[PDB]
Each structure stands twice: as structure tokens, then as C-alpha cells.
């Protein structure tokens, strides 16, 4: 029979994205585990204890702190990162020395970090095979278009990596720091101006609804110990997550026209914090908050989200960033990348951002058909990188590219392997 | 239409006219002006439908490399 | 021990005749400032990446002044010179003569082509809207040629 089918090797596919790491098996369709990119630490006792499971971190503990690992898509705190990887392997009950491991990572990465990761995976965990495919190529693999312009809209970094014929263009990456973190800080300072104090979930033990903007009754369960600031920040991150999920909505730069009307319609919504303070949000504030991704009009410095330029006079915003990325491409392949725009990123779920992005791109780039491709399924938007990793590991011909432990020893220098075998 | 335009015949008519004859005359006039504008745009080398032929690499079109088979399995 | 593990059938490698230091004597005659190191680097890049010009120029690291068409022209002229020097004793025909033929390219034409394409892509919105309207109206007049021709013949 003709070999249309691909061969599956049971190879684990690992991801190290900025906010969440998504492990899974080879030929499946969904990641088995997706832990957040944080690792706990408790030093109350003389010894040291680590807490890595997502559920176990959220509970209060006497002396407990939470430290970030994935800063900007590059691995940091490698000593804790390897511990998290080992725990994640142990929970999955993976069998070493008989399963290849495919590791995905961002476009920009330190060479020393790659060397350390490969050395640990090949000499400590004793995995037989390894590989390091770049994240934008892997996302393109997930969506099945081998010639596309990946436009990521993640939490920390917005990355636009052009891809020609299935491989990324390293020098053509445009990295802007205006991303979900910018929205988080901006909405935090908006909450600060309004005087609303967000309380964590664990503090609330008995509460009653109160729609008035004034303070509301909320019985507090106070523990004997003291709570760290990082713990409270991580807990508040969840509340900002649902609040960004629900409140935000973007419109095509017509906010100034209906600025007066929106108060007249009284279309404000309420977001109930665990405290119970159902804070009203006028439609103008939500619309401006959503549009802030596309033009950073906020002049309050963004609370440590300062002015940034490509590969980081005025921050450009998403639409002009995409226009700049398109312009630098050669005219030979510019229409090919224009007609195939893959927009990944969980922040794309904000209604209307993709539609007005398409409108701005087609208006500001006349005569070049710009069709934006996204995904209807939520799991495809959220974990496209792992989908691409799984499909690449399941591919038959790809198997002539695995990096072996004996091959790594014989070559010795990681420079030769990284340039050729990636 | 331009080998013998109708706008020359209509003033010289010896038979009863009709709206339809003037319809046809206006339509051929529109044909003429559209073609004239097309030619004027082509002369200025601003016509998108006319482009220079692009070079083709002889090596790529002959044999399939490993990456292309991998991309078939991809799709 | 089914050595034909499938998928090895596709371990096809694109073949590009190579040059060594000795063969550079034939290449000695040919802001360019080309030399042995740059040529061998170009050939290694073209052998590794399966002749994809944008990825080759992007992964290129010897020096940044090298432009797409310069690389293309240098590669084509080196290939044709080597091939002709390799069909000198026994005349080359068929497929190989045909490639030699195509490789009688020209770098100036393409830069003209690329400049022309950029100029067209840089046109104002009004001009390109007018062009689109002209094409639409031309096709609209196209679709009813038969009836118009018959009516003109009758008139
Ligand atoms: N429906 C939603 N709309 C908008 N933002 C959301 C939504 N759901 C979650 N978020 C938040 O938006 C951010 C999106 O992070 P995402 O998971 O896409 O990043 P990642 O996997 O770390 O990868 P990368 O940042 O490199 O693109 C997170 O902070 C997440 O909590
Ligand atoms: Mg991320």
C-alpha cells in the first residue's frame, strides 16, 4: 500500500511558553498537563521543599513564595526549571531511555541555555533522542500552512516571525513588549485610580452581593502566619485573567464618536471580585483598554511597561508592527506571507481585535490581499505550539533528524549540532 | 468598433432613428474610452496586469528534496 | 532487519557539483570583492539549505552587503562555468545542456523586475482603485460582446 500514513514514535512533546508549559505525548491531540510557568518555594523548615503542582500552590502556607521562570520566552532559573521538568516527567509516568523528547522554544534564545538544556536532557535524564524546533515553525506546523506569517499575541511578548517554506527567518523577527502584561499593568493602574482594592480568593470566607461602588461586607478568614506579596500577586493574576476574559472588547478607532453616547446608553457591566464589590466599568474604559494593544495612547508610563522598539520614538502597536514586518519582506514572497497570516495567542479571544486588525491591514496596505487566518477551536489557539510539536514528532521522514546522545558526544561541541541539527 | 464608428453614421442617417441606436453608439464610445485609458495606463508602466517574466531556478523544479517530502507529510 | 525502513526512499539529496581549491584556478578569472572563502561559504549554504534564496541570504553571515541578486548571479555563473569546464572534453547535451541554457540569466533584468514590482506595490490607493474599477468595467463590457456585436451588425 502507498505509505500516506505517518509513523508515531511515542515521543513526548514539551513546551516552555512564557505563561504556561504544556507537556503531552506524540500522536495525541491534546496536552496531558499544562502547568503555569511558576514554581513554589517554602523555607519555613531547616530543609527545602518544592511545590510544583498547579493546585497545591494556590493554598496559603506559612513561609511560601512564588518565583517566575519564563521571563520573556527564554529559560531562566535553570536550576528550578530542571526540577520542574523532572517533576512533570515523573507525574506523567514517562519511561526514559526509550522515548524521544521534542523540546520547543522561542525564536530568540541564549546559546548557553540551549547547551545546558541539551546537556541535561542527554546526560542526566538519559533520553535517547532530542530535538529543538523553533516555536513559530512549530505553530505553522500546527496550522498546516508551511508558508505563513506567524503573529503571536502572548502574555509577555508579541512576536512576529515570518516563515518561508516551513522554516523561520531569524533576522526578520519583530519583538514588541506590548502584550498581555501591558494590559494587566494598565488595568491594574486603572483599578488603582478608581480606589478599588482587590482581595484574594482565600481571604473570603463569607460574603454577600453588593452592587454599590462603596465598600462591601466580606468576612475574612485570617491565618496565624503572614502571607508573602508574591503569593497575593499570583492569586490576583487569576482575577485579572477572568476580568480580561469578560470585560474587554475592541472597536475600530470609533471610540471618540460614541464617547458621549456610551454614558447615555448605560451599557456598563459589573465584574464581581471575590470581595463582592461589583465595580461598574463604562464601555469607554473597556474599549480604550482593548484598543491600547493597537495604539499605546496611555501616557502614565504603564507601570514599568516603558517605551520599547523592535527587538526589545513611539511604541508602534500591533497593526503598524505587522505592516512593518510585511514591508521588510522581499517583494518576491511578500504576497505569499500577506495572504497567509496565522494569528495565535490566547489574547486573540478578545472580541473584535482580529476584525479591526484585518481592516487596518487591508486599508493601510492597498492592493495586497490580506486574509487573516485564526482558529475557531479554543484548544487550537491556546496550545498551537504543542499541536505542531506533536504532529512533527508523529511525522515519518522527520525521524532522520533526531540528535543522539552518542552523536552529541562524538560531535562534542554544541555549536556544530545547533547550527545543523538544531 | 473603431474600424467604422457609429457616431459617423448617426448624423448622416436617412432612416428613422431609435433610442437603441444611440444606446449602441454610447456603448461603443465607452468601449473606446476604456481602451484608451487602458493603453494610457499601460504606457506609463503602471499596469498591474503586465509584469516582467520572473527567473526560475533549474535545480529546484527537477528533483524532490527531503524537506519537500516532509512537507507533504506535514499537510 | 527490513533495512528499507520506509521513509528512507525520500532521503533524496539535491546534487550540486562542488569546487575545491584546485578548481578555483578555473574560477580565478571570474563592490563585489569575491574570494575563495565567500564562494565556499555560499556553496555550503546552498548545499545545506535546499536552494531557498531568502533563507540562504538570511542565514548568510560572512558580510551583510551581499544582496539577493548578487548571490544569485554569482552562484549561477560559477555553476555554469564549472559545468562547461566539465563538459569540455565530452560535449554536454540533453538535460545538462538545457540547464546551461537557462542559466544565461542577467542580474540587471531582475533588479529591474524587483524595482518595478515595488513601484507598483507602492502606488497610491486612488490609482490602484482606479485600476481595479477599470478591470471590473472591462470585464463587464466583456461579458456581453456577442449581443453588442450582433446589434452593431444589424445597425
Ligand atoms: N480569553 C482570554 N482572553 C485574553 N487573555 C486571556 C484569555 N484567557 C487567558 N488570558 C490570559 O492572556 C495571556 C495569554 O497567555 P498565553 O497562554 O497565550 O501565552 P504563552 O502560552 O505563555 O505563550 P506566548 O506568551 O509565548 O505567546 C495569559 O496571561 C492568560 O492568562
Ligand atoms: Mg508565552
UniProtKB/TrEMBL annotation, chain A:
Q: Name one Pfam family in it.
A: Actin
Q: List UniProt keywords, sorted A-Z.
A: ATP-binding, Metal-binding, Nucleotide-binding
One biological process term from GO is: kinetochore assembly
- Going by the entry's taxonomy, the superkingdom of the source organism is recorded as Eukaryota
Cite the GO molecular-function annotations of the record.
ATP binding; chromatin binding; histone binding
Kindly list the positions annotated as binding ATP.
20, 155, 241, 346
- Where Mg(2+) is bound, by residue? 18
Quick check: keyword Cytoplasm in the entry? no
- Entry GO terms, CC: Ino80 complex; NuA4 histone acetyltransferase complex; Swr1 complex
Q: What PANTHER family does this protein's entry cite?
A: ACTIN
Family to which this protein belongs: Belongs to the actin family.
Record-given protein name: Actin
Species, as recorded:
Komagataella phaffii (strain GS115 / ATCC 20864)
From TrEMBL, chain B:
Where's it found, cell-wise? Nucleus
Outline what the protein does.
Component of the NuA4 histone acetyltransferase complex which is involved in transcriptional activation of selected genes principally by acetylation of nucleosomal histone H4 and H2A. The NuA4 complex is also involved in DNA repair.
Subunit comment: Component of the NuA4 histone acetyltransferase complex.
Q: Which family does it belong to?
A: Belongs to the EAF1 family.
Question: Protein name, please?
Answer: Chromatin modification-related protein EAF1
Identify the species of origin.
Answer: Komagataella phaffii (strain GS115 / ATCC 20864) (Yeast)
* Span of the entire protein shown here: 227 to 301 of 1051
From TrEMBL, chain C:
Task: Indicate where this protein resides in the cell.
Answer: Nucleus
Instruction: Pinpoint the DAMP1 SANT/Myb-like domain residues.
Output: 32-81
**Family from the record:** Belongs to the SWC4 family.
Sum up the protein's function in the record's words: Component of the SWR1 complex which mediates the ATP-dependent exchange of histone H2A for the H2A variant HZT1 leading to transcriptional regulation of selected genes by chromatin remodeling. Component of the NuA4 histone acetyltransferase complex which is involved in transcriptional activation of selected genes principally by acetylation of nucleosomal histone H4 and H2A. The NuA4 complex is also involved in DNA repair.
Name the record gives this protein: SWR1-complex protein 4
The lineage, from the top, is:
Eukaryota, Fungi, Dikarya, Ascomycota, Saccharomycotina
Included range, full protein: 104 to 360 of 565
Amino acid at each position: 500500500p502507498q505509505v500516506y500514513g505517518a509513523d508515531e514514535i511515542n515521543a513526548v512533546v514539551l513546551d516552555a511558553s512564557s505563561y504556561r508549559t504544556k507537556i503531552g505525548y506524540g500522536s495525541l491531540d491534546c496536552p496531558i498537563l499544562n502547568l503555569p510557568s511558576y514554581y513554589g518555594h517554602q523555607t519555613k523548615d531547616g530543609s527545602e521543599k518544592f511545590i510544583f503542582e498547579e493546585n497545591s500552590m494556590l493554598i496559603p502556607r506559612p513561609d511560601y513564595e512564588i518565583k517566575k521562570i519564563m521571563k520573556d520566552g527564554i529559560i531562566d532559573d535553570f536550576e528550578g526549571a530542571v526540577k520542574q521538568y523532572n517533576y512533570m516527567f515523573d507525574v506523567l509516568k514517562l519511561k526514559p531511555s526509550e522515548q524521544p523528547i521534542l523540546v520547543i522554544e522561542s525564536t530568540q534564545n541564549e546559546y548557553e541555555k540551549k547547551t545546558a538544556l541539551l546537556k541535561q536532557l542527554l546526560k542526566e535524564n538519559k533520553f535517547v533522542a532530542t530535538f529543538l524546533i523553533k516555536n513559530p515553525t512549530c505553530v505553522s506546523f500546527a496550522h498546516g500552512r508551511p508558508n505563513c506569517l506567524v503573529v503571536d499575541l502572548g502574555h509577555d511578548l508579541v512576536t512576529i516571525t515570518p516563515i518561508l517554506d516551513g522554516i523561520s527567518l531569524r533576522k526578520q523577527v519583530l519583538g514588541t513588549h506590548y502584550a498581555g502584561a501591558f494590559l494587566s499593568q494598565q488595568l491594574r493602574q486603572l483599578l488603582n485610580h478608581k480606589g478599588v482594592e482587590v482581595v484574594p480568593v482565600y481571604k473570603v470566607k463569607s460574603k454577600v452581593p453588593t452592587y454599590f461602588p462603596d465598600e462591601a461586607k466580606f468576612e475574612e478568614r485570617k491565618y496565624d502566619f503572614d502571607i508573602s506579596e508574591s503569593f497575593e500577586n499570583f492569586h490576583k493574576l487569576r482575577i485579572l485573567r477572568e476580568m480580561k476574559e469578560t470585560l474587554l472588547q475592541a472597536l475600530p478607532d470609533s471610540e471618540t464618536e460614541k464617547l458621549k453616547e456610551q454614558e447615555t446608553e448605560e451599557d456598563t457591566r459589573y465584574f464581581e471580585f471575590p470581595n463582592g464589590l461589583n465595580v461598574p466599568f463604562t464601555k469607554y474604559e473597556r474599549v480604550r483598554l482593548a484598543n491600547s494593544l493597537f495604539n499605546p495612547s496611555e501616557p502614565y508610563t504603564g507601570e514599568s511597561g516603558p517605551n520599547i522598539v523592535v527587538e526589545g520614538d513611539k511604541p508602534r502597536g500591533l497593526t503598524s508592527l505587522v505592516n512593518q514586518a510585511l514591508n521588510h519582506l522581499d517583494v518576491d514572497l511578500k504576497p505569499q506571507l500577506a495572504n497567509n497570516i496565522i494569528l495565535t495567542g490566547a489574547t486573540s479571544l478578545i472580541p473584535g481585535v482580529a476584525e479591526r486588525l484585518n481592516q487596518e491591514l487591508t486599508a493601510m496596505n492597498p492592493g495586497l490581499k490580506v486574509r487573516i487566518h485564526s482558529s475557531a477551536n479554543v484548544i487550537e489557539r491556546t496550545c498551537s505550539a504543542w499541536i505542531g510539536g506533536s504532529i512533527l514528532s508523529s511525522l515519518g521522514t522527520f525521524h532522520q533528524l533526531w540528535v543522539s546522545e552518542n552523536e552529541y558526544d562524538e560531535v562534542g561541541a554544541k555549536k556544530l549540532i545547533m547550527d545543523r541539527f538544531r | 468598433t473603431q474600424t467604422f464608428p457609429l457616431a459617423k453614421l448617426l448624423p448622416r442617417s436617412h432612416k428613422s432613428l431609435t433610442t437603441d441606436a444611440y444606446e449602441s453608439a454610447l456603448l461603443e464610445g465607452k468601449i473606446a474610452v476604456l481602451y484608451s485609458r487602458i493603453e494610457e495606463l499601460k504606457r506609463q508602466r503602471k499596469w498591474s496586469l503586465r509584469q516582467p517574466k520572473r527567473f526560475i531556478d533549474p535545480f529546484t523544479r527537477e528533483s524532490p528534496t527531503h524537506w519537500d517530502h516532509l512537507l507533504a507529510e506535514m499537510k | 532487519k527490513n533495512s528499507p525502513y520506509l521513509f528512507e526512499k525520500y532521503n533524496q539529496k539535491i546534487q550540486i557539483p562542488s569546487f575545491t581549491k584546485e578548481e578555483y584556478d578555473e574560477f580565478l578569472k571570474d563592490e563585489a570583492s569575491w574570494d575563495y572563502d565567500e564562494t565556499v561559504h555560499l556553496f555550503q549554504l546552498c548545499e545545506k539549505w535546499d536552494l531557498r534564496w531568502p533563507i540562504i541570504v538570511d542565514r548568510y553571515e560572512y558580510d551583510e552587503r551581499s544582496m539577493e541578486e548578487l548571490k544569485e548571479r554569482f552562484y549561477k555563473v560559477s555553476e555554469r562555468i564549472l559545468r562547461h569546464k566539465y563538459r569540455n572534453v565530452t560535449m554536454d547535451d540533453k538535460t545538462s545542456l538545457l540547464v546551461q541554457t537557462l542559466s544565461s540569466f542577467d542580474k540587471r533584468r531582475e533588479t529591474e523586475r524587483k524595482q518595478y514590482l515595488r513601484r507598483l506595490l507602492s502606488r497610491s490607493p486612488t490609482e490602484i482603485a482606479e485600476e481595479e474599477s477599470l478591470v471590473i468595467e472591462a470585464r463587464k463590457f466583456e461579458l456581453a460582446a456577442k449581443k453588442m456585436l450582433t446589434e452593431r451588425a444589424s445597425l
